[PDB]
Amino acid sequence: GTHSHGLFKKLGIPGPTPLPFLGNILSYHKGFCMFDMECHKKYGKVWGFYDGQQPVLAITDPDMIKTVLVKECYSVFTNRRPFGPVGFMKSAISIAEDEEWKRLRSLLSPTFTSGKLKEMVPIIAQYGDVLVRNLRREAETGKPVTLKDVFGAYSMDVITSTSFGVNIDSLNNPQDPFVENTKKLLRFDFLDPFFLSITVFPFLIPILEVLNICVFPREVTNFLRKSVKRMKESRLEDTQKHRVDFLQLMIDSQNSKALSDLELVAQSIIFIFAGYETTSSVLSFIMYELATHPDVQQKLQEEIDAVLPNKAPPTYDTVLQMEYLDMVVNETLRLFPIAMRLERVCKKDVEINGMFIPKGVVVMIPSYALHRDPKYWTEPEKFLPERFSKKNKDNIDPYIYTPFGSGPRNCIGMRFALMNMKLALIRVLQNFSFKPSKETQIPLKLSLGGLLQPEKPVVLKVESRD
Amino acid sequence: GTHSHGLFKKLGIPGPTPLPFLGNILSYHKGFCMFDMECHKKYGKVWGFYDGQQPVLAITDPDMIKTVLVKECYSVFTNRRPFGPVGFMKSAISIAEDEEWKRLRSLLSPTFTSGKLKEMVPIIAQYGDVLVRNLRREAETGKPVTLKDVFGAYSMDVITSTSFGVNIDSLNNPQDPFVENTKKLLRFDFLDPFFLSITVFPFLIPILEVLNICVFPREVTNFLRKSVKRMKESRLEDTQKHRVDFLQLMIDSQNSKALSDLELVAQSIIFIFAGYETTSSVLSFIMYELATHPDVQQKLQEEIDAVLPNKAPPTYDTVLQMEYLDMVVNETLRLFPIAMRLERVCKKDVEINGMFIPKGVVVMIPSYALHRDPKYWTEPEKFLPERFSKKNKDNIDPYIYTPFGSGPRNCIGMRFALMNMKLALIRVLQNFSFKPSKETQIPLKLSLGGLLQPEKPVVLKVESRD
Ligand code: HEM
Ligand code: HEM
């Protein structure tokens, strides 16, 4: 009920006083972000709370964050928190621990190099054209557009083609059984009744595992495992067809300790899970900010037209030339860091930067609250891309601004996700301008659940530049 | 039900084919020893079986045993199998794991040196006199004597005085609340219904832990924790009284990483648990063999009388002079190695002595079966102390004969237990001879439960040498 609930009291660390059994989870009734913001305001640089009986130590000092994410990653702070019955997906790189994670990160690191990304760009660009065509249908119909739907389909299109060479126009083919399954790989809501109950009753997770109950949908993981099996068998029957998708990269990495067959499928699944809703969410937030800041949208369209005259198709190198595009993406990720928090489990008693941290504590970095901390950001609630201009970006501490984490366990898809989103943004802004409609919620309100998402879906009027 | 049950089949390792859920536990219906003997006979040098879903790999090659117990102890084979809800007794040295065990073994190793034992010998010897007095009461009454009762009291007397300076004649004071509690610290029967159920349902152990259900009796551990607290407070109130018990040694080791207060109590309890029933059991087996081999008993009495003329009291150095006494003890421990098995969990995939062993497998050394293996022992079912004579003992492989284990995690009480038993044996044989009575079971039969013990308690006629 309370065994660990005296820990922060004994260490002299402030925080909200926990209830028996629940710890502090009733404080999540307005979501993770308001809880972290309010704790930061009332307790200062460090504080502790309890997710059930699990102690969590929040840290905000940039030097201490670097020690945790970078300096002592391999020695002390190697793994994330365990989160529920996970089955074979225990082998997914984001879930793996210690030397198993370190191996998978080695096997998969070459897959995400800029050189491999550059070869994927033509595939990603194809679906920006598909996005533009589908957008244009809804633009000369005058209907306001639900961004999560069109960017959801775009995100899914890019995934299926860059992961498996499966080429689908998912918006217009929603009944395709491939899309029907992958679309179920949505982010977990850790404030939903199931995950709250597992937080209060963590002793039930082994029971769920022994019964093969998994938080990833069994029908979907069964479908995808079967599919990758058949795909790998087909690529054996046609070795002349030279492919550049993530499956082929992992197939090639299986020969000259290497990836097992089930480890391969776990990564295929986690890449869909990692990229699907995140990409569409960020794209939706970005378009919301551009619609509500027309001067920014116009400046960005001017940059795109200067780099790519007359709707010239974007390329790897021309994307990297667009400074203001980078600033807009980075400033939206500052406001809306969809991970909300970074976490590492402390593997052993340590003293870092003068503070003792016991073995077993989860150390948490509250990215959302730090992204909006007025000690580090002038007017942090405002959308101001110039924060990230060449004459201002030196003021930005890389352990305060952490939308993709930091250190050896940072986001391995970061370069891909940025290139993916920028290519979409370029193609859509070459062709359309986005404006608020009657049904647009302004100012945007955030959901009170466990996911960083708008309270109501973002809807925008879409107009052809022609 | 069966997830791991294909492991030994896939590795090409022979063994009894497991049933769903149960594994091979129905094969324990005649105890651990007959199972290990029969497996060794039918499968050869290595075999595998399943305790529920837990794979166990039995090894018999002396080189491989050395690698496991000695060479790769710290790297790969550091811990024993987990066995049930254990509460704070997780800190007992026999239960601790990895660096926590390595620390406790360092803190407690100086406590068991020959120098500290030599200072304890006068205390142990006092209770050999008490044993002789109590024996003499039952000898001039002509009643056959139940060995577990008189050696149980002796074992308990030595424990209370060498552990805590508590001086009790436990045979004649059974209602003393100290004795009433410590006497409940009997060995676990891992074939009893509770431990079989936990073997089949290991996913229930976390539920028991969260409810503070412990396999060590709570009333007893509560009593002893309270007692050690009051004892430590008294020794503070009388620092001139200089003590040589295990409590004082651990108190002194607390000052010039060191032992915590709760770690101290856990060791006090585990030392009673480790020494109480083991010592009395071995003493009973030894006296059974001496009663049924009068020529051995006479030869031993002749050696004792030569080293200690006219019932001279034994001392540390004169005990170590008695070669035949050592041979008798060692040969009884060969027949009756009360641990039955040694076990280590494999922490990582390794290849030792040409064999691949996966992470998570329990490697087991079947001491009982190896002690009775005719490849290593002429007529292994016979009691033959001369096996251990100076002209024969070189034939004895120290990884086949393992009554106290081997390597860094061997029995830390070995020297104490041997000195304890030898001092008792000397004092009793100086005063009495032991003979079979009408109610003595000859040949001795072993129990079919989970503990190496006689089927019926050993009873012997006891006669004064006068
Ligand atoms: C805008 C899109 C994305 C954002 C904001 C994002 C953000 C993050 C963050 C904050 C982390 C935690 C890093 C840490 O704990 O230090 C993470 C980890 C990770 N991300 Fe992303 N991510 C995005 C897209 C993707 C994509 C598209 C992929 C794969 C194709 C991906 C794969 C991963 C993986 C595998 C990890 C765990 C890495 C490890 O444990 O070694 N992410 N991401
Ligand atoms: C005839 C009496 C005894 C016998 C036959 C015996 C036998 C054993 C055996 C076979 C082991 C396992 C070693 C291994 O796994 O390699 C062991 C471990 C151990 N024994 Fe004994 N024992 C006896 C008495 C005692 C006594 C009297 C004490 C304490 C006062 C004691 C304390 C321990 C401890 C603490 C361990 C675990 C050591 C560790 O994990 O570091 N034993 N014993």
Side-chain angles (χ1 to χ4, degrees), chain B residues 434-459:
Chain B
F434 289 70
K435 304 180 173 180
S437 71
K438 343 148 188 179
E439 303 165 347
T440 305
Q441 170 188 64
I442 305 174
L444 184 42
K445 296 308 172 183
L446 291 176
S447 170
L448 296 197
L451 292 171
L452 193 52
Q453 61 182 23
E455 192 185 35
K456 146 178 185 171
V458 174
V459 180

Side-chain angles (χ1 to χ4, degrees), chain B residues 15-16 27 33-49 58:
Chain B
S27 289
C33 294
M34 204 190 94
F35 179 62
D36 291 352
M37 298 279 293
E38 292 195 338
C39 284
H40 189 20
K41 172 198 151 163
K42 70 179 54 170
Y43 303 119
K45 67 191 184 46
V46 289
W47 67 92
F49 59 92

Side-chain angles (χ1 to χ4, degrees), chain A residues 69 80 93-94 101 105 112 246 270-271 274-275 278-279 282 333 338-339 342-344 402-406 408-413 416-417 421:
Chain A
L69 297 183
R80 295 186 183 88
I93 179 169
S94 56
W101 165 78
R105 185 95 186 198
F112 292 88
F246 281 102
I270 208 72
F271 295 160
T278 55
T279 307
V282 177
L333 282 168
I338 58 190
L342 313 168
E343 297 184 342
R344 305 286 189 273
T402 57
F404 297 97
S406 196
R409 202 142 188 188
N410 75 339
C411 177
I412 198 172
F416 178 98
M421 294 188 293

